[PDB]
Amino acid sequence: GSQILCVGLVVLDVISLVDKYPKEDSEIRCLSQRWQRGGNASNSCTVLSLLGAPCAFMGSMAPGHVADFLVADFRRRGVDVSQVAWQSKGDTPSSCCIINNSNGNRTIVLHDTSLPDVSATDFEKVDLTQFKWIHIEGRNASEQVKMLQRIDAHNTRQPPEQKIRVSVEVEKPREELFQLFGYGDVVFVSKDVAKHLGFQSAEEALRGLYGRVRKGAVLVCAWAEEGADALGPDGKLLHSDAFPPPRVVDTLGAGDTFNASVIFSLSQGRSVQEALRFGCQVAGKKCGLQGFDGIV
Amino acid sequence: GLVPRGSQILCVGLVVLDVISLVDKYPKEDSEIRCLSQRWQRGGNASNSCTVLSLLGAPCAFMGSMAPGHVADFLVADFRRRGVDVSQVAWQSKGDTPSSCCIINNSNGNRTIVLHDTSLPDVSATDFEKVDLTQFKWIHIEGRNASEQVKMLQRIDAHNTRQPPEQKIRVSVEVEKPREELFQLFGYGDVVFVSKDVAKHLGFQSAEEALRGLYGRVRKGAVLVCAWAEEGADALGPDGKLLHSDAFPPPRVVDTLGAGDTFNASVIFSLSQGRSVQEALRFGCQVAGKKCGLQGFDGIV
Ligand SMILES: CCc1cc2nc(C(F)(F)F)c(C#N)c(N3CC[C@](C)(O)C3)c2[nH]1
Ligand SMILES: CCc1cc2nc(C(F)(F)F)c(C#N)c(N3CC[C@](C)(O)C3)c2[nH]1
Ligand SMILES: [Cl-]
Incomplete structure (x- = not known):
């Protein structure tokens, strides 16, 4: 068991860096724009990979040019996409992120494409012997509980x-x-x-x-x-x-x-x-950087 | 491919990727909210004109600044989807392909815009000097970098003098x-x-x-x-x-x-x-009038 699994979302974060947070009905102009691989589990994966830990992402992805960017980002990070539950019905979720440069505050306007979530069925086809740790990002609770019960059951037999x-x-x-x-x-x-x-x-x-x-x-x-x-x-x-x-x-x-x-x-x-302490340490280093590069 | 001589209408100006979100209430700072709908639209004046000219049945070409990337990729495939010739694009080594974020409030209809960055340089008179004009019957310039476009216009005047x-x-x-x-x-x-x-x-x-x-x-x-x-x-x-x-x-x-x-x-x-x-x-007013009752440009003709 060498890998850490992260079950949850992968989102395309379309980031706009503003010098001051916009007022309603205003026409601000951003300082800089960037595309970045988002979603809680997808971010945890980036961080884990940067910390030197072999990790694997599991989440729903809809084939397209958006997924091609996200998959290329995971691969450039060394994040194992093998367990990705590729869907046919839906688009890859995207979000509009306004980052206020003066305070580092982040405002996320998420477009949840209503892509089918990773089910206990998708999770059942996963070889749990390669995993040291498994992290689940709380989305489809009732269905994730079935994946959780499946882990408890495996643990008793171990x-x-x-x-x-x-x-x-x-x-x-x-x-x-x-x-x-x-x-x-x-x-x-x-x-x-x-x-x-x-x-x-x-x-x-x-x-x-x-x-x-x-x-x-x-x-x-x-x-x-x-x-x-x-x-x-x-x-x-x-x-x-x-x-x-x-x-x-x-x-x-x-x-x-x-x-x-x-x-x-x-x-x-x-x-x-x-x-x-370490959690706070690495989260705090990140807050003074743009993106995840440079935390270690 | 082979464009026949004096056959295209060229539009010089902005292409921008507009990400448009419709929200229940305007989001407050440091919040993670869900939008009702999200559209990714190709915008810009010369960009929009090209789309319309293509729908009207005209061979048309766009000349604007773009930087290689995934934003440019979406815009180039939208241009092509609207039959717009994209071979005159001034591809750039430095800067971000323009992208604007629009937040529309459901309860009051008010639009909040986060305009694209300055980073990407406009099309220059040296960029325009490289273009073989012979395939164009008409050239339309969206006013932006006036000093530079003036030279482009002086160039078309020079070309015209000897024709x-x-x-x-x-x-x-x-x-x-x-x-x-x-x-x-x-x-x-x-x-x-x-x-x-x-x-x-x-x-x-x-x-x-x-x-x-x-x-x-x-x-x-x-x-x-x-x-x-x-x-x-x-x-x-x-x-x-x-x-x-x-x-x-x-x-x-x-x-x-x-x-x-x-x-x-x-x-x-x-x-x-x-x-x-x-x-x-008359025609201008007719087409622009028809467009106003339609979402996007789909059935303007
Ligand atoms: C109100 C938004 C906000 C400001 C802020 N500042 C810091 C700082 F201490 F580094 F300055 C941290 C950190 N680390 C932090 N959060 C992000 C989530 C967290 C893991 O609970 C800690 C912050 N969240
Ligand atoms: C104040 C916002 C606004 C409302 C509106 N309505 C129409 C309508 F007559 F069709 F109802 C047209 C038209 N045609 C129009 N404009 C948009 C630019 C234009 C070419 O001057 C015409 C409009 N602009
Ligand atoms: Cl502009």
Whole structure:
């Protein structure tokens, strides 16, 4: 088990870099434009690859010239596309990303093409013996739970030595996804999902939502400039201060850089404290760079 | 391939990739929202004119700046989809192929635009010097880099001087942006298009006021054309006769985006076909009117 699998989205991010965020009905002119391979799992993959970890992407892709750019990006990164669930009905999703240069804030206007999501069926044809770790980006909850149950089942039939570690990301404040809370050894819950539940801090969110996690699972919550916090079976709250760059220029994919760096550090067998710190470290380095090149 | 001699209408100007999103509410900074619909459209004045000329049944070619890439690839395949000849493109070593982001609010209809970057250089007089003019019957220039286009226009004038009247290249100019640098372009071309917005910024309040007020700026024998949306369009020749055509509005107005370009290309086409300035104004108004009740350019003819 040498690879890390990331199940989720691949999107074409059409990035416009603005000197100030536009006012409604205004006609701003951007400083620079760029095309970049997006989607949470696709970003985590980039980050993992840059960190030296052999990784594989699994997500739906619609053949076309857009997919040709995305696939070429994965291949240039060394991201294994073999497990890609190629669809026939639909187009590859795209998004319009306004990056405010003065603060690094990112505004994503997503076009979800209604492409069929990766199903338990697509997941059943996957050889789980090559994977050290598997990360699922919370989208089709009910169907992903079937992929999650399939991993638990494989793990029981395996020695503690060659067991697959699982991580789950709850990013959007969707009720269907709160069932995944749930599964996986490491559960990543976004600051957005936390505020949706009436939690005003990462520690509030952790203490409040730990009940919802599997026995032995680590619940992780990043809180932008406030750093990130973790809560494991011991009940001890772990915290990492952020690593902000002096000039924050691009936060697009920062949360993904966080996730992949926590998964990476924990995959390398480091403490949750060390992994929390490293997550913040790599996410913070990224926030001072455009794209993902230069974080290591 | 082999283009026959004096057969094409050339359009020199912008090509841009417009990514258009329709949203429930305008997105606030640092938010990940889902759009209702997303369109990737080929825009730009000379670009749009080419599309219309192709639909009208004219062999047409586009000359604009593009940088090799995936944005250029989408635009070149859209050009070809609309039968536009793309062999005159000034391919660039530095800069980004223009791409604009438009956010349309559902609840109020207001459009927020993130305009393309300055990075890509315009078509130059040295870029235009390389073109063998003989395959063109008409050359239309969208006013942008005025100093440089003036030399292009001087070049067409030079070419024309040494040709029989039956093989002389007719020329048109579009001054659409209210930029000072452009107003020198009035003195060039056989047909001069002035926009309602340019006319207003110069103090004019009607097509009549604009044509009578600016006809002095044109060269001897030129036609100065001004379309004023719902008020129709006027043309003014060297005879001093102010021509007019009323607008031909559609039953319900769908998309007005690119209708000025549809008008321009239709006036050019009609004049290129040997029709009169009055017959061309009319046709221009008819085609631009039909376009307004249609989404995109699909069935304008
Ligand atoms: C309000 C938007 C925003 C600003 C910002 N700044 C930083 C900085 F500390 F580096 F300056 C980080 C980082 N690391 C960060 N996020 C991105 C998601 C995250 C993993 O929770 C941390 C941020 N998010
Ligand atoms: C204020 C926005 C606007 C509405 C509108 N409606 C029409 C209609 F008459 F068809 F209803 C036309 C036309 N033809 C038109 N313009 C767009 C450029 C043009 C060549 O001057 C004509 C319009 N512009
Ligand atoms: Cl422009």
